[PDB]
Design a protein around this ligand. Structure first.
Ligand SMILES: Cc1ncc(COP(=O)(O)O)c(CN)c1O
Ligand SMILES: Cc1ncc(COP(=O)(O)O)c(CN)c1O
Ligand SMILES: Cc1ncc(COP(=O)(O)O)c(CN)c1O
Ligand SMILES: Cc1ncc(COP(=O)(O)O)c(CN)c1O
Lengths: 425, 425, 425, 425
């Protein structure tokens, strides 16, 4: 019942392959607070990696889950259906952007969601290839590791992942890749490796998560939409991390001015319970033949009621607006800290999907991974849990529950400021 | 509040890709009883497809879940660890067959488990190919669909799944495939398509589930073990369906007289909550570098305490001995019915993983898919939930909770018996 | 000069990868005779591996070549056409089996022939997968090595060859593979790994060459044709080695009672000059868009007139009939030797595609690669060039020119006869 | 005996997939002269696509061919070796750039050469992936089509080519790709799709042929060599078209200041006879196990003595020097014509590997293909045979034999000048 003892036991029973960002064993939690086995208290700015937008154990969510535990926990929908699954699908068909008839499939993880969205796109187009972007992250199954634009550590040592996945450039002006280069990198694929007629879908994160919290602009997204229409390519928006309200709208695509053919959701959608899904143009969704979709746990009853309560909470507690206000308050505080620390070369984010990127002496081509990691460690020592991300591990992101208290906003910003001041000593 | 009303809403909100064995919407359940939204009661012989060996909402399991629901439901282990995960791993390391040290990785679904088992074998052997068997089922992600020995419906319209997966024959004398043919088929692969030094693993189900409840014999499994040993090939045992006590021992491999290098488990391990995992040789498990294993929901807290409680229940309530007793009563009962119906050409099963196979006029070359389907439908009319399986859809399997009461064992057999008699005239 | 001296320079300037069956350097050859640099004379029963059906430098062929040599040796057909290429295609379109219009593509090597045949079937059916047989040999390019049913040493050390090539069993009663087993193995692929809708072609050798001179039966070929017809799959007959008269008919398929959709030809077609090609159902051949088929040396001028002359020589000199006569004399001579050597467990062959298989003590389960190799080495010391084959290197094949005189036939057989007697002493 | 009639015959016997640049049937030729079946004469500025650097039927080469034709034309080296093959390998071990021991493999086509070079690199490094450049061209086999950086028409309609071939950007300032962009595009592959440890080789054309006659600079080639050295990746130089003295030196790599690990050669190596090969670092060439390399026609006797004679002709006639002077006279004349026609936006080339690129209104962003095509057709009408190329087909290239006469260089330039003036009237 000590963090160190538990870490020792871990090294004996669990593979080192499962990294451990923080050597801490959480015991209990509530909203933005977490207590370890030693009773220490921490402020959670990671949110279980964008999974806790309604916070740890939201009362409404927990009450719903407890009620469902009195009825049943599993039947396997495809064997014996149940209402929570159907209801969520109906609601997602409406909530997901796209002014047309849609259908929803529930699965269990973000990885499976992307897996099924691609299987569906292939069935609908009768094509086999897919295009993803540099720095993308879509999961850890063989195929999603291929879609993921990061070999190390996700696929390191395992040999080459499935082929017929082509790499396009994600637009990122901060690093010299115009939206023109991005659109041009897709045409390069068409001309050099896979003609449009062999590409079932173009998979993209409206805002890259693990990739650095880089957001696609509406104009770029609009150009991509047009490129897919022109070629009959399904546009797949992976919103496992950008969805569930993190950006100010339930789904980031709503702010792009265009609708994808398929959308995946997970993480925060159920506020702490295993659930994910795929919503898309009905005709596309129906392309797969009966019996070709499913999974044992898919749309687990408890997770479904949890998701339904999360949606009601976003409405009841005005969480979308709070995401926006929270984001502005965070960037303002971050911009202040930056006026005193050159290493911070960028402060960005839609809604509450906030991040800052660190460069050596503000040199926009000198990723400061060491400083980034130093801040994470300092924040832990001050009781703050943070996550870094980005292909160069020089991006600090904030994923604190949207239900955060005013005081905790000040507390996190303060601690962060202290970290940059104590590191510069 | 009407099964048919709900089915209608289902067809407008959910893709046809998701099949529906029984057009019934469950509302609540307890042990082996399920009640639909109309209040009609059914006896559950499908168990959410082998996920409810401890029955629906086993009270010990639910109380554990309730206690944990008071502490936390999610942190993402890689970010902040927690005891239920660590603790289940230790238990699994001890329980899965193998006299060597093992390490366990917790994920969320059976597909993920197979996916990770293979990634681990690839990293450990530094090889890329894998071998699976005919009629096998390992999941619905691109790669596991490739391992799965069945294209339709799981892959129709989609195109070809990931390559570098070679097919071997599962031993099945009942249908002409001898143990010698099985083994010969692996050497044929070594000789024709992929040398031993390019095969990371041979994935096999000790007892094929979707494949028809065909069990491997200890003798075959031993030849297979020796063959893997000789080539440094990892033997992966997929015990998602055969595991968690279904066959009379916690894992089917315990009755094979040999131990695999890796074992994947799921479904019944958590008795109704989303969880799966991989347990294998520690040094093999540790071949993946830190950061190469993970997943957002992996080893969800709630599901972890559920699995821990399930294992305690197997001990306290003697479920393994009950499995063996249940299987004998079922097989005795089914053999009785077979005396009056020649169509029943085989009654088989280890422990409680019981199945009967139907043939037109007892002709072992004429699988009766029509009769099989009819029995399933007649049973539903009598209040019994059944599932069929096998590549020819002529196998009826029984996956009723091991916690079933004696009277319910008779009720089910009697119903099954009436279904056959009534299928005659 | 010295054979050994040349072998030494060889080991210094050429990689060990290029094996050397006979450590002999040829200087001159004519018809069935070869003289090495040491002036020693050899009777050639290998024919450059089935490339010299009209013998070394057939005078008619040489005269045609010399005449063309005065005109031009290369222009690259795609840039400037030339009659020899056009004229050969026209003749092949009519002589290749198939009661329908055909078109012919000329390439340079048997490997390229197969490569293009598969590319054309893929473009015509719009499918990507192919099926090949156990023990098959189709070339040494990445893709043809995948089709080739033998990994060592062709693919050894290189890793896995291209995917989406599935393995069926070649019918071979001698070793336990019945025609039913072979056809069942194709359905197995359809059910387990690749649906018919995803298979562009089934590649087969009417008579396997490197595989062991195992011939397909008309009945089997007919079942395969019906199976292909039923699923829209192209039947590709690789006749690089069985073609050009070796079996008694210009192409082996003529003796099968059915026509393939595509046929690849090579080796003896040009009697000792670099040339290969693909003749097939015209609309299939035309499925590829202009600019899609090509190659620099494709249908080389000198090699085309040689091929046109080889065809005339076959008519004028009655070689098809002679192949049958030659084959009968060889099989009789070999069966007489077999009456004294039990190790000879089989004497088989269509036309002059003759082979004998050696077994230890005469046990079909004990391939005698050692005796086989001894016969080859002894025969060479006696002035007879032989080649072995088969997956277990226990097959002696006879590929001697069809233009051989009766005396060389008696002579070659005596030499072979003595080798067996001296090997037992 | 009419071009039109032969073309009509062609449409009925040969597939449309084989495009016909010029609808002319050549009857005979000599050095740089070609006569069609109608007796019309042409000045060949295409050389059978860089295959006739020593011109059509060079008398010395023809005499060597004739002498060998009296000895033998084929035995299949790996069966019965022969001196011509051994001697050419010895010479290429010296001639190919690289101050260190080398070994040589002889195959038959430029495609097989690239196929074997990769096979060799994979065995040497024990890795499966490869990297090629945009606009590259390496052959028409499945695998070389994957390496080739152009889908249509080379591999269009056929589906997706073999995976595990990744795309980098070829340096090309003219179109905005800096050397840094090229090098960085390689790092992008290492981070996003295939770690260095999985890349067996990087394949590059010192000067892209079909790609538009774009040459790599010494500086870039040096960075590419350092990058390879650091990761253990084999650098494969494909000199099928750039080699055989086209650039002023025998091989273009000689002018790069660095040596590749493997080099492929073909086309002009044998002045118009089928031959190709791979020369590389001995230890690397030897990585393949014995028997792993081969080919029926490989290093054909007649093509070998032709290649040997071609190398002698280069030394005797000083063709390397003439290449440089030819290139200069060509550039000067083209720069002249360029002054009156702004459409000619670039005049480039190493040695005699000369090309000009056309732009609509000199606007480098508007690749003028229609004008390029017009020039080719006008030139044909004026008796000059030309070829275009480049990803946008706006590149005119000159591959006229190096043995061309001074008076014909003027004649050729005059015809081109007239074409531009007239196309602009
Ligand atoms: C955009 C995105 N897509 C997919 C996934 C995979 O989801 P899971 O971990 O639930 O399998 C993640 C997880 N961080 C993600 O951020
Ligand atoms: C042997 C086996 N392996 C893997 C799976 C896949 O598990 P999941 O559906 O939880 O993804 C199943 C599911 N019926 C199975 O029976
Ligand atoms: C049936 C078959 N197919 C293809 C090939 C390959 O031909 P090549 O060596 O000319 O590339 C051979 C050569 N022995 C063959 O026998
Ligand atoms: C650089 C290059 N590599 C490979 C090849 C393929 O050679 P082949 O046409 O002889 O098969 C070519 C032919 N245009 C080429 O230019």
């Amino acid at each position: 019942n000590s963090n160190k003892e538990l870490m020792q036991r871990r090294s004996q029973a669990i593979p080192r392959g499962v990294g451990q960002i923080h050597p801490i064993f959480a015991d209990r939690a509530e909203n933005c607070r977490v207590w370890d086995v030693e009773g220490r208290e921490y402020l959670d700015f990671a949110g279980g990696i964008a999974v806790l937008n309604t916070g740890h154990l939201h009362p409404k969510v927990v009450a719903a889950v407890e009620a469902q535990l009195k009825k049943l926990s599993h039947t396997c929908f495809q064997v014996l259906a149940y209402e929570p699954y159907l209801e969520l699908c109906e609601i997602m068909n409406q909530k997901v952007p796209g002014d047309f008839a849609k259908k929803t499939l529930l699965v269990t993880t973000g990885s499976e969601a992307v897996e099924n969205a691609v299987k569906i796109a292939r069935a609908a187009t009768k094509r086999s290839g897919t295009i993803a972007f540099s720095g993308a992250y879509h999961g850890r199954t063989h195929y999603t590791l291929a879609l993921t634009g990061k070999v190390n550590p996700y696929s390191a040592g395992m040999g080459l992942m499935p082929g017929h996945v082509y790499r396009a450039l994600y637009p990122c002006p901060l690093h010299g890749i115009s939206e023109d280069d991005a659109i041009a990198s897709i045409h390069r694929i068409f001309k050099n490796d896979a003609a449009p007629e062999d590409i079932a879908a173009i998979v993209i994160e409206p805002v890259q998560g693990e990739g650095g919290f880089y957001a696609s602009s509406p104009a770029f997204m609009q150009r991509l939409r047009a490129l897919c229409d022109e070629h009959g390519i399904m546009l797949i928006a992976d919103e496992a991390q950008s969805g569930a309200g993190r950006t100010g709208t339930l789904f980031a695509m709503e702010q792009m001015g265009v609708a994808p053919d398929l959308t995946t959701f997970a993480k925060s959608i159920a506020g702490g319970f295993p659930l994910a899904g795929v919503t898309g143009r009905a005709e596309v969704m129906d392309a797969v033949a009966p019996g070709g979709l499913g999974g044992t746990y898919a749309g687990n009853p408890i997770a479904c009621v949890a998701a339904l309560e999360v949606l009601k909470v976003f409405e009841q507690e005005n969480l979308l607006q709070k995401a926006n206000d929270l984001g502005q308050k965070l960037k303002d505080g971050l911009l202040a800290i930056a006026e005193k620390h050159p290493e911070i070369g960028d402060v960005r984010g839609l809604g509450a999907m906030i991040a800052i990127e660190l460069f050596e002496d503000g040199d926009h081509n000198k990723p400061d991974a060491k400083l980034t990691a130093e801040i994470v460690a300092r924040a832990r020592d001050k009781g703050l849990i943070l996550l870094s991300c980005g292909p160069y591990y020089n991006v600090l992101r904030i994923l604190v529950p949207l239900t955060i208290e005013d005081a905790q906003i000040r507390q996190g910003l303060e601690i962060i400021s202290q970290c940059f001041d104590e590191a510069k000593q």
